[PDB]
Design a protein around this ligand. Structure first.
Ligand SMILES: O=c1ccn([C@@H]2O[C@H](COP(=O)(O)OP(=O)(O)OP(=O)(O)O)[C@@H](O)[C@H]2O)c(=O)[nH]1
Lengths: 679, 68, 1058, 106, 53, 49
């Protein structure tokens, strides 16, 4: 038998990870008959072969492979070096080769200029000697056919796909498996009657993007002849822990209005890739739930779910939904009822944009729940780590509040430029009519005045504020539009974000804000008009990274020794220059065997000017604030491998638990240095 | 399956990596041939749930119990 | 602040009012991708669970511990599994695939909660974007929503009953019958639901009475087809819980699929005929195991798909450029010819001596255009209906020839050689007017007016209206003033190449997409003639070489004179004559190639091709048969109905030109050569085998099937709600509905389209060409018009559609079993009825119902008024006849009157309905209902529910109609007063299944035993095993056939002989 | 009349020019490059949501894969590593949205 | 109008058959391989961050 | 220099057969709205034949 899965299957590691409990199969037992297959090199060959050929030809060829039929290529050097190898060590010559050619190669002459051997080599071709010879222009369908029928195939090129490539001659003449009745691996085929494909995982959620292309192309042409089997059917047929790889499903639920004992389904939705660990933690299963529980504010485990995922779309009309944040009708979600779970798979929580250790700027619209998400995020501290303290995050209003006329006060006086308004309430009435969605022309006349305030005041103030903030440690900073972080030249990762709710209603729900609620809302419209359209991309994309890796590591280092499983890596200054103390800058947490490996890495080729001060901090541990400015290069994440759970924010500060006296401050030209205990 | 296994046994028994008297990939389109399989029971039915389990379930769906 | 919260609610409503389906970007890359590769539909899907869509649910639980009857009576104290619920009130609701272990989900599902819950959300889906309430729905979209629900219901079970195992019964409950074991986690629960008659009968309860009345031997399998031993049985007939409706739908589906079935022998014959003896394929010859491969289709479907593809591709040229490029690359990997312009140098490099030997190639050449333009011209032959290859403007002599020049003589020669290979009809007149322009000042000819004088551009022509009169009457070109023009004219008339044909394809398996030509025929602009040998050697007998000879002869006659070129020397004249003489006999093989091998390659490539050929007749040199337009229609024009009448004025022209390179084409003609040792059969066998291993064209056939099915379903469902031209029966007139306009028709069509895309699993462009216009009265036709007004049309006959037939069957069954889908028919009567009687409000006594034809009723239509009552006199409302009547007696209202005066009527009438004597009969015709059961031993009053409903009625919505139904009892019960307000006007207990199903009898309340007419083949000993009472009863138990066919890929059955 | 654009590099960014240009170049190439690789670039896939209510993974070309990568470069802006030999202690890194003046396409 | 201009230009550019041979591909590849600097350092130390040699 | 008659004819056909509820609006509902709005105006209509 043979089964194909949407994932890169390997015979070494895929047994360790399993992949079958991954996709949701109950293979767990003394099964030892589901033998995997090596498709790493096959994916690499597919990528290399799409470079020259066409995707349709390559995929429609590779689909007709009999993966349970062992075979192999072996490439020949070109004709010249081939003949050189025929000559030297001549007792390997196939008998097809011409009698004259063999009789002339068996001679010990220099072969400098043999008048007849030159002709005999000119009229010699490789294709006649070795029978199955693929081509330099094979037009690959015969490649897969010849791999299907036979044991060895002879190529004169490297662009081949289907099996491994073996060398024919020694390296000089070139330039620079048992079955188990339940074989599995990627790349479905239709070679036999027993090839099956495991359904249950959507096509748009496949993460590899080459397996994804292969599946799309094969499933749009061979839909009616493929054998689909779900994870339950596969289960019935059968019957250095990596962090940042989490299992995700999505929840199927509908809205219910249980008034006076009469159930009434109202709407059906899909939560779109909440991670499985959070559903396990919160104890979510098939039952009814109330998602407010008091005073019309969400119960906040529901808020955590909605903020840890992508967004929910209606199942009737396949479009996004954006559930209502208020508690006023027409639409109010007060009671839901989860009904099932569909496609499960792993994803890489580490975004590709994040490779170096640097600050993070998360742009959100105005009316989002930034305050409540901060209140909910500052509490988590898994292994005594405090993954996101409240002091490491920069509020969105801070850069505008630090001005003599603050920014919002500066824009409140904008009604003087209009032809005639005479008051802020008349401005809010002249802009949007008797609901939101203001008049676009009037909003444009207002934006032409709002813009110079944002380009001439806010940008110059922010260009200094973000520098001052970057000096004193990594911080997670928010904003109301990417243009704020782009005009003011912001350093760090620029993550746009978005929330699954209607943010414009929060601007009416919240009361005690400067100016009327209508003014806050018009201000949000102006920021949204100053936005430079680009994909906001689902706020949960960040919170999933923030939370998920720690929960997994808590299973591995839940009970080990804190001294043996810990570390900290900061800027070092020698015991002199007191006219040793290091600023932390990072706090690693990982098993002992990886701390041993991190203990020996360089960590010293990274420099920065640390400027210690003499100011005291109200916090308990007696410590003095400091600063630091990296010079040359930034710490890449590869050093802190995928097996440790580090922190993303940190303040710069030094503790002084010896001879308490703060003298004069200074700059010292620190050097990075690993700092753990004995372990 | 059987044809490949037999040609591999032929290769092993004649002591050459490439067989010479093969049973598979011949010139004939023998594409309608069947063979005995564990997938088919004696009633011409599919063998996915074994007959013992089928009989046990069909009998268990009719049993009663004591009254309280 | 209440104004502010009003603002908030208004904004939330406006935010909910968004559009659902809106294409606002530009779709052209999508059209091209659709043209070159279309997604294949999902046709074959298997179901391993029992086929059924109706499930019996218990509504109110029984009383097992009771005082009258000891608990040792009931078969619940013994945990004896039963086929039916043992409640006190069981109703039968609808849930598609509640018992279906399916291989592929279709996303459609008509799932319904029991009547004791609110099902109003099922009827506010489509056009209720304005309904503010969450428990209300607009009555004017009822039958639209119901049509959509029926389409979902049909699309949900388009499956294929699967064959899964059996087992000899080891107990005495049956006579050793076989029992089908279906897959799943907990399969021990299905043996009691699938076989109601495999059960003991201990009691005299209702379940036991029924199972005792049934027949014994209609259980399990009773018929199989065992072809080989030790192999799967082909099919079987099994008795089991199903129902006639879904059984009939799946039978229709299997019949439709079996009509498409083809087999390996004929697939072999078709592929061999297509490849034309260059590609052998093999097929087995022995008893087989009954494969299923639904690929064959009819000709009307191919033609309709071709018309739709053309009306997409029309008038853009970016949708059609890539197709021609792909055919160019195919000709690259196939054709044996290869160009060698060094032949021109060899021929010209033997002249002794402004130098004639250095003009064509070495100088007058684009220097970046290789000879892909040549085979793009060749590929343009297959598509002269939409694409018209023409010579580019930049390849003309740049505003005048002046035959005295030399480069212009060469330019004329090359244009004259290259023009015959294009496909526009005005190539001859352009070839004439090139020389006519070049010879201005030397020879003159009379023209038609003073705009198109002789000094125009040769390319500014090319409409049949612009051919000079002197080009049609050669007598007008005097043989004394313009001898060269006279001679060139008659040469063009006599020796221009002749059209021919090649006869590709095989319509046995494939259909025939040809529209304006016979099937399996391919028009060519040149004469074809098969080759007599496979080792070709040069010859000179062909139209292209004769044309080259004629052109060289006329240019000799033109250059010989010191009459046109005054300053030339005798040496230069002799050199030009010699160059012409040698170029007349250049040794090129492109002409014999074009006449012997090129048409064979075109015919071999034509079948295996994503977009089939689309040709109009190649007319040689007469205006009267020159095609001046080709158009397609997708709707009618007026009250008129017939396509042959509205097609002349409701068409859209299609087609677009495409430039080429005269230099490239002429040099490819002049310099052609085969490889040194060419063997034709070997070469074409090798080069042609690889492109007959793929099977994409068969999936194209299946998509053609789905396209035609979708078009027919659209026309039927749209005719259901809006007045159309096609004749169809209508069953759902009794449901209220809206006066539909083009906007609502387009919206309903979009919902149908989205549902049919969701099923069948396809992502792109099904029904959008039709949806662009007005879909109320559509049609598909195509025509072209000649120059002389003669028009040819093609109106393909619309073949039947299984999906529309099944939708109509489902509606015809809904007409009788509307209660099972939650709907109730008729009006309702409001007015209190206080008594201790236990009759059910869904089946009222006849003396409480009145109608229009009753002595004493008042009827209130439009233009009614209310006038208050002063000084203690009764207020009055205006009768329809003009009378004023007090608030008493019984009345008759339309529902729209109440909806438009909902609040002014509540305040005036609710006090009189409640405690007075007023009784009103609202006229609804169709409405969803909701049940409320109560204990009959205690006081009950329905005023709260009825008042909630009345106050809840809105000008664009009504909630469900709440009925207050009593509960049945097994023993005596003391009575108590109950107060009714709403009662139906006709029987609506068609959904009640059984009351007190575990006791000996019902004694108080609604009573009914198990419906013996459903289980007909069990309760009637004289009925055949296959009888179905379909349009009036679903029967809930019957014979169902199950298949075990296998669907292998074509390449696993038809091998190749590499 | 003498017309000049002051600060031409800084005036070409993603919110008016590069976004429109990238959408245009990504859509125009789609027709005649349906499955082919450009200068050593594969034929990658990506899902689209341009049509409301539909969300499907659609194949793209090499010349469109390159526009995908180039757009994800232009969206963030550019980061310049300054290290001057006239002031000791200045090797900062700076990030702008100004269009580069060293590209072949400038 | 900007969008239309660039769209039509891209379509007409890609339609030309010259842009699909290996020679034009190679010429455009080698157009920017010069002896002048290209900041190869940050390229190297950015490829290093994903464990490629 | 090239035949644009096909493209011109096709686009004219599209403009001819476009579906637009505006003509029937002007022809049916606009006069009703004008006659409903006229008697309530401050400066009543002043027409010449
Ligand atoms: O140092 C640069 C100068 C400019 N040129 C190239 O010229 C283009 C425009 O050059 P600039 O952008 O520098 O001109 P400018 O705005 O400074 O004009 P003024 O404000 O002074 O009036 C840019 O695209 C750049 O690539 C560079 O090759 N070298």
């Amino acid at each position: 038998a043979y089964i194909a899965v949407p994932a890169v299957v390997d015979s070494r590691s895929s047994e360790a990870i399993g992949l079958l409990e991954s996709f949701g199969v109950d293979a767990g037992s003394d099964a030892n008959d589901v033998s995997y297959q090596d498709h790493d090199y096959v994916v690499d060959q597919l990528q290399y072969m799409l470079d020259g050929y066409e995707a349709g030809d390559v995929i429609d060829a590779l689909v007709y492979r009999n993966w349970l039929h062992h075979s192999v290529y072996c490439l020949l050097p070109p004709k010249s070096q081939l003949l050189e190898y025929w000559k030297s060590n001549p007792s390997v010559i196939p008998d097809n080769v011409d009698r004259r050619l063999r009789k002339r190669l068996m001679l010990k002459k220099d072969l400098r200029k043999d008048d007849e051997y030159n002709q005999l080599a000119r009229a010699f071709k490789i294709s006649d000697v070795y029978a199955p010879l693929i081509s330099s222009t094979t037009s690959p369908m015969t490649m897969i056919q010849n791999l299907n029928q036979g044991e060895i195939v002879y190529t004169t090129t490297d662009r081949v796909i289907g099996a491994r490539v073996l060398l024919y001659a020694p390296r000089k003449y070139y330039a620079s498996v048992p079955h188990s009745r339940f074989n599995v691996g990627t790349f479905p085929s239709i070679a036999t009657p027993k090839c099956s494909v495991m359904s249950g995982v959507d096509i748009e959620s496949i993460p590899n993007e080459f397996i994804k292309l292969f599946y799309q192309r094969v499933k749009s042409i061979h839909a009616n002849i493929l054998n689909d089997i779900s994870p339950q059917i596969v289960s019935d047929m059968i019957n250095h822990v990596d962090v940042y790889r989490v299992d995700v499903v999505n929840v199927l639920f509908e809205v219910v209005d249980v008034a006076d004992g009469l159930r009434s389904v109202s709407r059906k939705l899909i939560m779109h890739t909440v991670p499985v660990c959070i559903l396990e933690l919160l104890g979510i299963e098939i039952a009814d739930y109330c998602i407010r529980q008091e005073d019309g504010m969400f119960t906040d485990w529901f808020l955590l779910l909605t903020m840890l995922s992508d967004g929910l779309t209606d199942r009737r009309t396949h479009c996004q939904y954006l559930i209502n944040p208020s508690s006023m009708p027409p639409d109010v979600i007060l009671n839901i009822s989860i009904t099932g779970f569909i496609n499960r798979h792993t994803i890489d929580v580490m975004p590709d944009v994040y490779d170096f250790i640097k600050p993070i700027g998360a742009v959100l619209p105005k009316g989002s729940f930034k305050s409540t998400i901060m209140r909910v995020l500052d509490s988590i501290s898994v292994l005594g780590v405090k993954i996101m303290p409240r002091a490491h995050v920069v509020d969105s209003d801070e850069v505008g509040e630090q001005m003599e006329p603050t920014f919002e006060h500066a824009v409140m006086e904008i009604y003087k430029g209009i032809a005639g308004v005479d008051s802020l309430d008349d401005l809010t009435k002249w802009v949007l009519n008797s609901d939101l969605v203001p008049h676009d022309d009037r909003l444009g006349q207002l934006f032409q005045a709002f813009l110079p305030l944002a380009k001439d005041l806010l940008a110059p103030m922010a260009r200094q504020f973000y520098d001052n903030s970057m000096s004193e440690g990594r911080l997670l900073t928010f904003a109301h539009a990417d243009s704020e972080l782009l005009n003011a030249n912001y350093f760090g990762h620029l993550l746009r974000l978005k929330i699954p709710y209607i943010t414009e209603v929060n601007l009416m729900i919240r009361k005690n804000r400067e100016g009327g609620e209508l003014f806050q809302l018009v201000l949000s419209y102006l920021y949204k008009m100053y936005a430079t359209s680009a994909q906001p991309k689902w706020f949960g994309s960040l919170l999933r990274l923030l939370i998920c890796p720690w929960l997994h590591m808590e299973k591995l280092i839940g009970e080990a020794d804190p001294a043996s499983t810990s570390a900290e890596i900061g800027w070092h200054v020698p015991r002199e220059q007191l006219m040793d103390g290091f600023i932390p800058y990072v706090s690693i947490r990982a098993p002992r065997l990886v701390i041993e490996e991190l203990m020996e890495k360089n960590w010293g080729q990274y420099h920065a000017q640390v400027i210690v001060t003499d100011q005291l901090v109200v916090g308990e541990p007696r410590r003095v604030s400091a600063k630091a400015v990296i010079k040359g290069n930034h710490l890449p994440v590869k050093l802190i491998s995928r097996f440790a759970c580090f922190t993303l924010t940190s303040k710069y500060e030094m503790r002084l638990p010896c001879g308490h006296s703060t003298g004069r401050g200074a700059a010292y030209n620190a050097r990075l240095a690993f700092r753990s205990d004995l372990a | 399956d059987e044809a490949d296994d037999a040609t591999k046994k032929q290769a092993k028994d004649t002591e050459k990596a490439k067989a010479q008297v093969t049973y598979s990939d011949t010139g004939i389109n023998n594409a309608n041939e069947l063979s005995r399989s564990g997938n088919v029971d004696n009633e011409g039915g599919s063998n996915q749930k074994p007959m013992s389990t089928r009989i046990a379930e069909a009998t268990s769906a009719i049993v009663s119990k004591h009254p309280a | 602040s209440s104004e502010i919260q009003r603002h908030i609610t208004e904004f939330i409503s406006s935010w909910q009012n968004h559009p659902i389906v809106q294409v606002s970007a530009d779709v052209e890359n999508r059209k091209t991708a659709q043209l070159l590769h279309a997604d294949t539909p999902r046709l074959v899907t298997w179901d391993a669970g029992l086929c059924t869509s109706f499930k019996i649910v218990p509504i109110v639980p029984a009383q097992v511990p009771q005082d009258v009857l000891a608990y040792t009576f009931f078969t619940s104290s013994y945990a004896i599994q039963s086929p039916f619920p043992e409640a006190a009130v069981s109703r039968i609701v609808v849930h598609t695939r509640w018992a279906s272990n399916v291989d592929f989900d279709r996303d459609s599902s008509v799932i319904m909660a029991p009547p004791t819950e609110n099902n109003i959300h099922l009827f506010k889906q489509l056009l209720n974007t304005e309904t503010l309430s969450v428990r209300g729905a607009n009555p004017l979209m009822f039958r639209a929503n119901v049509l959509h629900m029926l389409l979902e219901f049909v699309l949900d079970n388009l499956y294929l009953n699967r064959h899964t195992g059996f087992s000899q019964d080891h107990t005495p409950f049956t006579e050793g019958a076989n029992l089908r074991s279906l897959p799943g986690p907990d399969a021990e629960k299905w043996y009691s639901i699938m076989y109601p008659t495999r059960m003991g009968t201990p009691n005299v309860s209702k379940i036991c009475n029924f199972v005792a009345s049934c027949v014994r031997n209609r259980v399990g399998r009773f018929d199989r087809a065992q072809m080989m031993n030790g192999a799967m049985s082909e099919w079987v007939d099994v008795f089991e819980t199903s129902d006639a409706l879904t059984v009939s739908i799946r039978g229709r589906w299997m019949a439709r699929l079996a009509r498409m079935n083809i087999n390996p022998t004929e697939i072999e014959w078709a592929l061999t005929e297509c490849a034309q003896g260059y590609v052998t394929v093999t097929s087995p010859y022995a008893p087989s195991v009954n494969r299923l491969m639904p690929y064959r289709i009819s000709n009307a479907e191919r033609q309709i798909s071709q018309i739709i593809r053309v009306m997409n591709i029309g008038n853009n040229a970016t949708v059609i450029q890539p197709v021609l490029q792909d055919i160019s690359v195919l000709l690259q990997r196939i054709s044996p010819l290869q160009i060698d312009p060094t032949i021109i140098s060899n021929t010209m490099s033997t002249v002794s001596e402004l130098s004639p030997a250095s003009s064509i190639l070495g100088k007058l050449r684009p220097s970046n255009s290789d000879f892909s333009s040549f085979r793009v011209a060749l590929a343009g032959w297959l598509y002269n209906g939409v694409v018209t290859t023409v010579i580019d403007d930049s390849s003309y002599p740049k505003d005048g020839g002046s035959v005295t020049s030399l480069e212009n003589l060469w330019d004329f020669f090359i244009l004259a050689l290259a023009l015959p290979l294009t496909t526009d009809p005005c190539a001859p007149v352009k070839a004439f007017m090139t020389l006519a322009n070049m010879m201005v000042g030397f020879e003159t000819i009379p023209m038609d007016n003073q705009i198109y004088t002789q000094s125009r551009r040769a390319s500014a022509f090319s409409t049949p209206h612009t051919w000079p009169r002197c080009f049609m009457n050669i007598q007008l070109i005097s043989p004394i003033d313009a001898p060269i023009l006279r001679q060139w004219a008659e040469i063009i008339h006599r020796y221009w190449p002749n059209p021919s044909q090649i006869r590709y394809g095989t319509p046995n398996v494939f259909g025939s997409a040809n529209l304006f030509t016979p099937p399996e025929v391919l028009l060519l602009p040149i004469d074809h003639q098969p080759a007599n040998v496979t080792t070709p050697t040069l010859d000179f007998t062909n139209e292209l070489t004769n044309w080259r000879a004629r052109v060289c002869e006329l240019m000799k006659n033109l250059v010989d004179n010191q009459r046109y070129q005054p300053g030339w020397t005798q040496s230069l004249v002799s050199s030009m004559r010699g160059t012409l003489g040698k170029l007349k006999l250049i040794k090129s093989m492109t002409p014999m190639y074009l006449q012997q091998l090129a048409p064979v390659e075109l015919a071999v490539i034509a079948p295996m091709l994503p977009f089939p050929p689309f040709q109009v007749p190649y007319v040689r040199l007469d205006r009267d048969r020159v095609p001046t337009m080709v158009g397609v229609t997708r709707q009618s024009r007026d009250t008129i109905t017939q396509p042959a009448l509205s097609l002349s004025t409701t068409n859209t022209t299609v087609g677009v030109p495409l430039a080429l390179d005269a230099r490239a084409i002429t040099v490819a003609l002049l310099s052609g050569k085969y490889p040194p040792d060419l063997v034709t059969n070997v070469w074409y066998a090798d080069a042609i085998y690889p492109m007959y291993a793929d099977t994409e064209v068969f999936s194209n056939l299946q998509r053609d099937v789905i396209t035609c099915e979708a078009v027919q379903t659209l026309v039927t469902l749209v005719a259901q709600i809006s007045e159309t031209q096609y004749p169809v029966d209508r069953y759902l007139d009794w449901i209220p509905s809206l006066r539909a306009s083009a906007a609502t028709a387009a919206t309903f069509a979009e919902w149908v389209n989205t549902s049919m895309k969701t099923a069948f699993d396809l992502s792109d462009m099904l029904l959008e060409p039709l949806l662009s216009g007005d879909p109320r009265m559509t049609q598909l036709a195509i025509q072209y018009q000649q120059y002389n007004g003669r028009t040819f049309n093609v109106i393909p006959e619309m073949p039947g559609s299984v999906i529309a037939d099944c939708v109509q069957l489902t509606a015809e069954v809904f007409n009788h079993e509307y209660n099972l889908f939650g709907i109730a028919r008729g009006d309702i009567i409001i007015g209190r009825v206080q008594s201790t009687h236990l009759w059910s409000p869904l089946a009222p006594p006849p003396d409480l119902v009145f109608d229009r034809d009753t002595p004493g009723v008042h009827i209130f239509g439009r233009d009614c008024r209310i006038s208050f009552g002063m000084n203690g006199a009764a207020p009055m409302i205006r009768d329809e006849t003009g009378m004023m009547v007090p608030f008493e007696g019984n009345w008759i209202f339309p529902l729209a009157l109440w909806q438009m005066n909902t609040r002014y009527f509540n305040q005036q009438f609710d006090a009189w309905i409640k405690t007075g004597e007023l009784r009103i009969r609202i006229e609804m015709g169709a409405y969803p209902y909701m049940l409320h059961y109560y204990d009959p031993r205690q006081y009950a009053n329905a005023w709260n529910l009825t008042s909630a409903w009345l106050e809840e009625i809105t000008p664009t919505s009504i909630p469900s109609v709440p009925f207050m139904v009593p509960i049945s009892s097994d023993h005596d019960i003391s009575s108590a007063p109950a107060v009714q307000y709403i009662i139906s006007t006709e029987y609506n207990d068609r959904s009640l299944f059984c009351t007190n199903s575990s006791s000996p009898q019902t004694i108080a309340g609604p009573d009914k035993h198990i419906p013996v007419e459903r289980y007909n083949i069990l309760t009637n000993p004289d009925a055949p095993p296959t009888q179905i009472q379909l349009p009036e009863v679903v029967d809930l138990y019957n014979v169902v056939t199950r298949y075990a066919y296998e669907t292998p890929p074509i390449t696993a059955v038809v091998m190749g002989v590499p | 009349i003498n017309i000049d654009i002051s600060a031409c590099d800084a005036s070409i960014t993603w919110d008016f020019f590069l976004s429109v240009i990238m959408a245009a170049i990504h859509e125009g190439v789609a027709s005649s490059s349906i499955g082919k690789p450009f200068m050593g670039v594969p034929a990658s896939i990506v899902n689209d949501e341009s049509v409301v209510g539909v969300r499907a993974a659609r194949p793209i070309s090499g010349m469109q894969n390159m526009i995908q990568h180039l757009s994800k470069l232009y969206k963030r802006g550019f980061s310049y590593r300054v290290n001057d030999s006239f002031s000791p202690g200045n090797d900062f890194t700076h990030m702008t949205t100004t269009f580069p003046s060293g590209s072949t396409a400038t | 109008y900007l969008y239309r201009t660039w769209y039509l230009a891209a379509a007409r550019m890609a339609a030309q058959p010259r842009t699909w041979d290996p020679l034009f591909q190679a010429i455009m590849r080698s157009q920017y391989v010069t002896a002048r600097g290209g900041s190869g350092a940050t390229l190297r130390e950015s490829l290093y961050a994903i464990n490629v040699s």
